[PDB]
Amino acid sequence: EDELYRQSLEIISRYLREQATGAKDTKPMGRSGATSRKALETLRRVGDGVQRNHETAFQGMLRKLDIKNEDDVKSLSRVMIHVFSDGVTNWGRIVTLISFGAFVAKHLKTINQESCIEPLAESITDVLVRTKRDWLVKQRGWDGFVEFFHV
Numbered sequence: 550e551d552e553l554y555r556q557s558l559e560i561i562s563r564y565l566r567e568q569a570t571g572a573k574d575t576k577p578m579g580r581s582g583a584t585s586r587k588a589l590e591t592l593r594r595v596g597d598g599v600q601r602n603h604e605t606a607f608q609g610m611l612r613k614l615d616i617k618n619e620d621d622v623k624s625l626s627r628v629m630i631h632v633f634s635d636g637v638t639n640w641g642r643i644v645t646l647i648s649f650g651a652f653v654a655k656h657l658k659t660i661n662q663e664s665c666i667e668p669l670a671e672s673i674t675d676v677l678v679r680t681k682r683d684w685l686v687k688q689r690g691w692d693g694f695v696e697f698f699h700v
């Protein structure tokens with residue numbers, strides 16, 4: 550409920566922030582073997598591969614959306630809201646969305662819009678949690694994500 554949004558926000562905000570700045574957080578999210586720390590380490594491995602694989606489509610979509618400020622993020626979130634609430638729900642579709650978020654975050658860092666990374670992460674979290682709540686809960690939350698992408 551409140552915890553599923555708070556946990557997802559902590560993982561996504563930290564992943565987007567460290568991808569843009571290019572530096573991992575010196576202060577951990579929790580204890581050594583916590584669900585959130587494991588999900589973030591999985592995101593660093595999986596999410597980075599998604600970005601290089603989907604590079605051309607990610608660069609295309611970014612250029613078409615034309616994100617330059619916070620209002621652009623808030624307004625074009627309605628585009629994301631509608632496209633994501635329709636279609637098959639899976640971990641591959643979930644990880645590609647977060648990877649696009651990190652791709653956008655990296656772009657925002659270059660145009661001196663580092664303040665946009667947090668409301669950007671809030672938009673991704675609110676879509677994922679609100680539209681796909683039942684699925685995520687039945688899939689053991691972020692543990693299901695860790696289990697799904699194991700090496």
Ligand SMILES: CC(C)(C)c1ccc(CN2CCN(S(=O)(=O)Nc3ccc(SCCc4ccccc4)cc3C(=O)O)CC2)cc1
Nearest residue numbers: 610613614622625626628629632633642645646649653672
């Ligand atoms: C917070 C902001 C930055 C505003 C923001 C976030 C995220 C998005 C959308 N976000 C969806 C999920 N993907 S994806 O996982 O790569 N898979 C897809 C990629 C393309 C499409 S076609 C409609 C997208 C479109 C519409 C109009 C212009 C440019 C693109 C569908 C999917 C899918 O699976 O439904 C990434 C794109 C938009 C806007």
